[PDB]
Every structure is written in structure tokens, then in C-alpha cells.
Structure 1
Amino acid sequence: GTVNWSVEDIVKGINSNNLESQLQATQAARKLLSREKQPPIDNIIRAGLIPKFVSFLGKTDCSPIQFESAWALTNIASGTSEQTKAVVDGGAIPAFISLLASPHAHISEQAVWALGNIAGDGSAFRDLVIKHGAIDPLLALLAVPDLSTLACGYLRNLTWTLSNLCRNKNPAPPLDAVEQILPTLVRLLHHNDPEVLADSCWAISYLTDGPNERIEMVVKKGVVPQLVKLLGATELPIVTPALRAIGNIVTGTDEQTQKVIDAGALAVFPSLLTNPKTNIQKEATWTMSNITAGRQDQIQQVVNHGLVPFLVGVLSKADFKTQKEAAWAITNYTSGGTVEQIVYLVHCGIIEPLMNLLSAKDTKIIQVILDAISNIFQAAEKLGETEKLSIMIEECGGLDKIEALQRHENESVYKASLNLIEKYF
């Protein structure tokens, strides 16, 4: 019937002034564009079919052709930036926004999907979709007493499109649009569907990936406790975005970081810092590094939750990126911590893994480790116990690594190693 048509046949059908022939040709185009391997998007564009599909989007009298053209244009817009641009240049944004209010649920869903692709292209098309007024009808589709009444796929597509409206920086989404979307996003963040939860967490992670004012916009809605609960979830697709969001939040002020701590986040990090998925370990160690850069009371809460031994463990054995994040965490700890907190860090066994990491090739991690060692030595100076620490480093074999780094190509490593050896060895 409409299977395995040539683009020539599709064009002949769509060029006929018979709406039923046009519908069948558009369905053939949809089926061609829905094939697993290499859909002929470029051939369809070159045939000049995008304007015809956009015109069909407005055939209120023929809902099937609306649906077929919406599907075809969705799949064209799923391709390269040039193909999405081809869809946009045909005038598809306002037509899809108009279809958002269609009485046919499948057509409205297809329009949601298409606008999601368009906005997902980048910040320019995102903001253009916003300027055409998509947020109001999109959110109206979700203004129901109980989200569970909506079809699962429909709700998932709406959540994903909203997440794409929150995505990308340079520039970040308009502030008024973020404020308009956030309430519905919190409501979705309390939904029970794993995919909806994952995409809501991804949206929140986008919104928190910026200055402290954006983070404040998010945290003032009260989402941090729910984010921590989701941090404790079993599904990795949920934990990953939740963890990214929590990390973004703790990159902000001390008060926002304290909101993360007050919600019980630290209690989850024994598992996160031992998670078998390397990316979770890296992201959790980076989050810990930003928490240890906080106040001394926040460092103390890190201590009380027994997380210093887990940092020692990650420093001792882990993927090198995770070990680098752990070195950052240790240096921040030693920079902001009290003498008591620093000696506790040493008592947990940080020196040996920290010295073993000086064998790496990355210069910046070497500089970070040397700064942490300098801070620990200052702490030991205020206690007059520098010789015990020097003996601990020498027995470990770290003095050899430092006197070797004296000959490092980088100037900062050279000077820091020489300062350490001149002042304490």
C-alpha cells in the first residue's frame, strides 16, 4: 500500500490535488522516514516536501494527514542541525504550536514531540520555540488534577520536551520561561514513572547548571529533598541526573550547599562513592569535592557521616578521573579545614594514596596534591609535629617522588616541590 515508495512516487502523490492521494503519499513518506537504517531525509528535503507537510499540518478537516505530516516532520527534525533548520524554515513552529490544542491526542503528542526536537537542536531554536508561545499550551496539556490520568507515553513526551526547553546555556533559557515551567517540573518530579522522573531530574540539572541565581530559583521551590530521595533510587537513569543536579546545587553558595546537606544527602554517599558505575563514582566524588570546599561546619558534617574513609578509598583505587576528583576534594578539605580535621584526615590514611598519586603524568593533579601536602604540613607546624609527618611521607616513598618532581617541566610543580623539600626535608 504505502510501503517502500520512491521519493518520486511520494512527490507525484503529494503534487496531485486529491487530498486522499496526498494523504497516502504523506503516509508513505512517514514510513520511509521511520525506517531503521538511513532514512532519506536529505532526499525528502531536496524534493521540496517540507512546505507541503507544513501546509498539511493545518488541514483541520483531515486529521490523518495532520498526523502523518507531523510524524514526517518530527523525523526530519530529528536529524542534523541543517535538517531541523529546514523544518523550522518551512514555518513548522507555529503550526505545531497550533496543533498542541488538537482534540486528537495522538496529533497533540506528535506536535509535542516535534517541538521537542526543534528545541533540542540548540539554544537559538529553543528560544524561538519559546517566543512563538509554546510554553502556555504545553503546560496546559499538563494542568490536570492527577498526572496518572494521562497516557504514559504522552506524559513522557511532554516531560522530555519540557526538559529540552530547560536545556543548553550560552544563553540559558529566559528567566520568565524558567519560572513559568518550574512549578509543573516539580509536580512531575513527584511522579511515579521512572522515565518521567529521569527527564524531570535532567531538566532540573540543566536549570541548576549556572550562576547562583538560577540555583536559587530552583532550590526555593523546595525540590532538594525530593532530589535526595531520588538520589537514593535503584534505577541508574534516575540516580545519574539526580546526582548531577545535587552536584550543580552544591557548586553554589554555602547556604544552598547546606540545603543539600540538611536534606540528608551525605547519607547516600557511602553507596555512591562505591557505586560500580564509574560515572556515578566520578560525579559523587566531584560533588564531595565541592562540599569540602564549604564551611568548616560542613567539612565537619562530612566527617561525622564517615565519608573521609570513603575518600581515602577512592583515592587508593578508582578510575583516574575519579581519583583526580578525590585529590581536588582532599585539597579543598585541607584548605578550609581546622587543624583537628586535617589531623583526622591524616589518621584515616590519606598520605600513602596521596603520595602514590604523585606518580601520575597529569601536571594539575600533581599541583593539587602538592598544595594539599603543603596545607597538611602547615597544620603539622601549628602542632609542632612536622617530623612525624615527614617520617610518614619518607617511609611511604613520597620524598623520592617530591625530589623527582623537583625536576618537573612545569614551573609550579618545580617550585612547590623545592619549597616542601627546603622547608620540611
Structure 2
Amino acid sequence: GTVNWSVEDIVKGINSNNLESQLQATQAARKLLSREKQPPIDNIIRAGLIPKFVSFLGKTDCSPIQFESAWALTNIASGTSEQTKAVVDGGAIPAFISLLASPHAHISEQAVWALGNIAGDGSAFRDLVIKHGAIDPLLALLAVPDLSTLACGYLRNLTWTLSNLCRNKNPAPPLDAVEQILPTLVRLLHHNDPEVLADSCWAISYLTDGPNERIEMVVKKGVVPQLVKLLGATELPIVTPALRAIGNIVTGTDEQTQKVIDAGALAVFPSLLTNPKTNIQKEATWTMSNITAGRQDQIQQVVNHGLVPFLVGVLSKADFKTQKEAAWAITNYTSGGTVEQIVYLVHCGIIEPLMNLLSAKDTKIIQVILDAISNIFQAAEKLGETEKLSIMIEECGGLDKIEALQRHENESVYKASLNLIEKYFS
């Protein structure tokens, strides 16, 4: 019927002054753009069809052509930046925002989807969608006593589009827009659909990725315990963005980090630090590295939760990028920890997996490890036990490697090592 029209046939019907021929031609254009087999986005654009599609969005008297244009434009906006720019250049933003109040839920849903694709392109279009006044009608669609009465796919599209209004960093979304959206985000964070939960956490993940004031706007809304609960979720699409958000929050002030510990996050880390998906282990160890960069009482909480053996674990065997975050976790630990805490580090066996990693080519990880070794040695003198550490480092071939690195031609590995030898190995 309307399957596999030529682009020229589609133009001939859209350029007719017959509304029904235009509807059929527009649906044919929609089916063309619905191919996952390289839809002819460009050819549709070069034919000048976007202004006609945008103008059909306002044909309230003929809701089907509103739906087919919304669908067709959605897919054009789903492509490259230039393809998205063409949809915006045709004036689609104010027309799509008008469709948010449509009495047909399937047209409203499509306009939600389309604005999500436009806002998803980047900061500028995201802020343009906001300036056109999209947030109020979007949030109004969620002003219900119970979210579960909304259609499941409708809710998912709304959450996803809201997710994109929080996304991207240069610049971050407007402060007043984030405050406007956050209460609805907080509610969606408590919904039972895992797709809504994942995209809700992704949204929180975006908002917490910035300076501490942005972190505070989220932390002040009380979402931290719920984030820690979603951290132990079964569905990996939920754990990943929940972990990025928790890890983002512990990049802030010690007080903001403490609320994450207070919510019980450290209890889930034995699983996270051994998780099979390599990216979870990297994110979890990076987060641990930023917790060990905190106060001594916070370092002590890492100790109480039995997480130091798990750091010895990731330092001994893991993806290399995970091992480098483990090195950072150790060095931050030894930079702010007490002498008793640094001695406890030795007794779970940090020293040998630390020295085996001096074998890496990565120049920055060598500075981190050498820095940690120095800090441990500094605690060894306050206990008057520097030699027993040297005997330890020599029996695992560490001293064998520490003075071999003096012939490294980055030249702080040059000297930080040579100091290490002529102060503790002479």
C-alpha cells in the first residue's frame, strides 16, 4: 500500500493539494525512514520535505498526518548532528512542544521521543528545547498520583527524554531547569520499571558529574539511599548508571562522601570489586580510590568493611585500567591514613602486588606506586621498622625493580626511585 515508495513519489504526493494523498505519501515517507537498513535520511532532506513535515504537525484536524510526520521527523532527528540540525532548522521544536498537549497519547508520545532526539544532540539544542518551554508540558504529563497508571512505554520515553535534558556538560543544563526537573526525577527513581530506573539513574548520573554545587542539588534531595539500594540491583543496566552516580558524588566534599558511606554503599563493594563486567570493576575501584582520598575515619570505614583485601585483589589481578585505579586507591590511602592503618595495609599483603606492577610501561602508575612505597616507608620509620620492610620488598624482587627504574628517562621516576634506594637500601 504505502511500502517502498520512491522519494520522488513521496514528493509528488506531499506536493499535491490533496490532504489524503499527502497523508499516504507521508506514511510512505515514515516507512522509508523506519528501515534499520540505512534509511534515506539525506535524500528525504535534500527533497525539501522537512518544512512540509513540520507544517503537518499543526494539522489538528487530521491527527494521522500529525503522527506520521512526528514519526518521520523523529527518525531524521535520530541521525547525525547535521540531520538533527535540519529538523531544528525547519522549526520543529515549537511544533513538537505543542503536540505534548495532544489528546492522542500516541502523538504526544512521539513528540516526547522527538524532543529527546533533538535535546540528545548536545548542549546547544538541549538548551534551545528548554528555552522553547518544553519542561513544563513534559513534567505535566507525569503529574499523576500513581505512575503505574501511565502506559509503560509512554513512561519510558518520558524518562529517557528527561534524561537527555540533564545530559552533557559544556555547559551543564541551567540550574533553574535542573531544580525544576529534579522532584520528578526523584519520583521516577522510586518506580518499579527497570528501564525507568536505569534512565532515571543515568539522569542523576549526569547531574552529579560536575562541581560540588551540582552534586549538592542532588544530594540535598535525599536520593543517596535509593541510589545505594539500586546499586545492589540484579539488572546490570541499572547497576552501571547507579554506580556512576555514586562514584560522581564521592568526588565532592567529605560531607557528601560521608552520606554515601552512611547509606551503606560500602557493603555492596565486595561484589562490585569482583564483578565480572570489567567496567563495573573499573568504576568501583575508582570510587574506592576517591573514598581512600577522604578523612581517616572514612578510610577506617573501608577497613571495617573488609575492603582492603579486595583492593589487594584488584591490584593482584584485574584489567590494567582497574589496577591503576587500585594503585590510586592505595596511594590515597597511604597519603591520608594513620600509621596503624598503613601497617594494616602491609599485613593484608599490599606490598607484593604493588611491586609486580612496577613492571608496567605506564609512566604515571610508576609515580603513584613509588609514592605509595615512600609513604609506607615513612610510616615504617615512625614505627622504627624500615628494615623489615626493605627485607620484605627485596624478597619479592621489588628492590630488584626499584633501582632498575633509575634508568627510566622520565626523570622523577629517575629520582624518586634513587632516593628510595639510598635511604632504605644501603
The reply to whether TM is greater than 0.5 is yes
1:351 corresponding residue in structure 2: 351
> How big is the shift at 1:50?
0.1
CA distance in 2 between partners of 1:125 and 1:38 (Å): 24
Shift of 1:69: 0.2
Task: Deviation per CA, 1:195-228: give whole Å up to 9, x if none.
Answer: 0000000000000000000000000000000000
Cα deviation code 1:145-169 (max 9, x no counterpart): 0000000000000000000000000
Q: Shift in Å at residue 411 of structure 1?
A: 0.9
CA distance in 1, matches of 2:422, 2:37: 66
In the TM superposition, residue 36 of structure 1 has moved relative to its aligned partner by: 1.7
Aligned partner of 1:113 in structure 2 is 113
- Percent of pairs identical after alignment? 100
Give 3-state SS (helix, strand or coil) of 1:214's partner.
Answer: helix
Deviation at 1:77, TM superposition (A): 0.2
Matches of 2:38 and 2:156, distance apart in 1: 26
Deviation at 1:182, TM superposition (A): 0.2
Aligned-residue offset at 1:20? 0.3
Aligned to 1:379: 379
* In structure 2, C-alpha distance between the alignment counterparts of 1:345 and 1:122, rounded to whole Å: 45
Structure-2 residue corresponding to 1:320 = 320
Match of 1:263 in 2: 263
Q: CA deviation at 1:259?
A: 0.2
Query: Helix, strand or coil: the match of 1:5?
Result: coil
Instruction: Find the aligned partners of 1:60 and 1:412 in 2 and give their Cα distance.
Output: 71
- 1:34 is displaced (CA, Å) by 0.1
Whole-Å separation in 2 of the counterparts to 1:166 and 1:423:
53
**Structure 2 segments unaligned to the other structure (5+ residues):** none
Q: Which SS does the other structure have where 1:233 is aligned? A: coil
**Alignment of structure 1 residues 387-402 onto 2, 5 Å:** 387-402=387-402
The Cα shift of 1:400 comes to 1.1
Give secondary structure in 1 for the equivalent of 2:412. Answer: helix
| Deviation, structure 1 residue 420 | 0.4
Q: For residue 232 of structure 1, report the CA deviation from its aligned partner.
A: 0.6
Deviations 1:62-101 (A, max 9, x none): 0000000000000000000000000000000000000000
* Cα drift, residue 15 of structure 1: 0.1
For residue 39 of structure 1, report the CA deviation from its aligned partner. Answer: 0.1
Deviations 1:40-66 (A, max 9, x none): 000000000000000000000000000
- Residue by residue over 1:96-116, the C-alpha shift from the partner in whole angstroms, topping out at 9 and shown as x without a partner, is 000000000000000000000
SS of 2:407's equivalent? Answer: coil
Q: What's the CA shift for 1:401?
A: 0.7
Which segments of structure 1 move beyond 6 Å, counting only runs of 4 or more?
none
Separation in 2, partners of 1:74, 1:101: 17
Q: CA deviation at 1:409?
A: 1.3
What SS does the aligned partner of 1:37 have? coil
Name 1:176's counterpart in structure 2.
176
Alpha-carbon separation, structure 2, partners of 1:135 and 1:271 = 38
| Structure 1 position 361 matched with structure 2 position 358 | no
Within a 5 Å distance, the mapping from 1:63-82 to structure 2 comes to 63-82=63-82
Residue 422 of structure 1 and its aligned partner are, at CA, apart by 1.3
Partner Cα separation in structure 1 for residue 401 and residue 171 of structure 2:
45
Shift of 1:418: 0.6
Structure 2 equivalent of residue 218 of structure 1: 218
SS at match of 1:361: coil
Give the Cα–Cα distance (whole angstroms) in 2 for the partners of residues 159 and 20 of structure 1.
Answer: 34
- Deviation of the 1:317 alpha carbon: 0.3
CA distance in structure 2 between the aligned counterparts of 1:180 and 1:90, rounded to whole angstroms: 28
Cα displacement string for residues 240-261 of structure 1 (whole angstroms, at most 9, x for unaligned residues): 0000000000000000000000
Q: Any stretches of 5+ residues in structure 1 without a counterpart?
A: none
**In the aligned structure 2, how far is the partner of 1:35 from the partner of 1:207?**
34
Work out the CA distance in 2 between the residues paired with 1:268 and 1:169. 29
Cα deviation digits, residues 362-385 of structure 1 (max 9, x gap): 000010000000000000011100
How far apart, in 2, do the equivalents of 1:412 and 1:52 lie? 65
In 2, the alpha carbon distance for the partners of 1:387 and 1:193 equals 59
TM-score by length of 2: 1.00
What is the Cα deviation at residue 288 of structure 1? 0.2
Q: CA deviation at 1:176?
A: 0.2
Distance of 1:15 and 1:281 partners within structure 2:
57
Deviations 1:114-145 (A, max 9, x none): 00000000000000000000000000000100
Q: Secondary structure at the residue paired with 1:26?
A: helix
Query: Equivalent residue for 1:35?
Result: 35
Deviation (angstroms), 1:24: 0.2
- Per-residue deviation at 1:266? 0.2
> What is the distance in 1 between the residues matched to 2:247 and 2:36?
37
In the TM superposition, what whole-angstrom CA distance separates every residue of 1:259-282 from its partner, at most 9, and x where no partner exists? 000000000000000001100001
Cα deviation for residue 339 of structure 1 reads: 0.2
Write the deviation string for residues 288-327 of structure 1: whole angstroms up to 9, x where unpaired: 0000000000000000000000000000000000000000
Match of 1:287 in 2: 287
Distance across 2 between alignment mates of 1:422 and 1:166: 54
Secondary structure in structure 2 of the residue aligned to 1:411: coil
Deviation at 1:412, TM superposition (A): 1.1
SS in 2 for 1:101: coil
Map of 1:301 onto structure 2: 301
Local SS of the residue matching 1:357: helix
Which SS does the other structure have where 1:406 is aligned? helix
In the TM superposition, residue 423 of structure 1 has moved relative to its aligned partner by: 1.0
Q: Give the Å deviation of 1:237.
A: 0.2
Separation in 1, partners of 2:337, 2:371: 14
SS at match of 2:403: helix
Query: How far, CA to CA, are the matches of 1:115 and 1:322 in structure 2?
Result: 37
